[PDB]
Design a protein around this nucleic acid. Sequence first.
DNA 1: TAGGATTGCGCAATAT
DNA 2: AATATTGCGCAATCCT
Lengths: 65, 67
Amino acid sequence: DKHSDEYKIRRERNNIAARKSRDKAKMRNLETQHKVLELTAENERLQKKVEQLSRELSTLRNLFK
Amino acid sequence: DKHSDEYKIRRERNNIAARKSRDKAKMRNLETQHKVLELTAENERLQKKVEQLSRELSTLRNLFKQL
DNA sequence: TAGGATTGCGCAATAT
DNA sequence: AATATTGCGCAATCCT
């Protein structure tokens, strides 16, 4: 009986729960997408560092010639 | 009018559309989670390379400095 | 004006 | 008893 207050409070609470559950899942997914952007940027930064370090090593080694 | 045969057909088509769009987003999420695992293993490889080269360069510079 | 894609929400069965 | 999760569906809105 959807007319009983018992039903109403039940729907009211579950609607809050469903929206909360759905918000949490959407947050977890957005974070995941952000971790990709972040890792991507950090890997780019490290590759640049690898290249710089290699240039520094070549330059010092040329000092032997 | 929700009794219209036109209405029922429109609902059926949108229900198919909704499932397809949800499937697609769920797949996209799964692909994104995999990319994180992949980018993480690459990040570990790069960190190791940077550490290795950094030690190699520190050693070489120290040799030149001890002249 | 038509029609699929996207998304948030409600309901209720089901799970914890 | 109560919250959390989710399949199905309605509908508003976005996008072609």
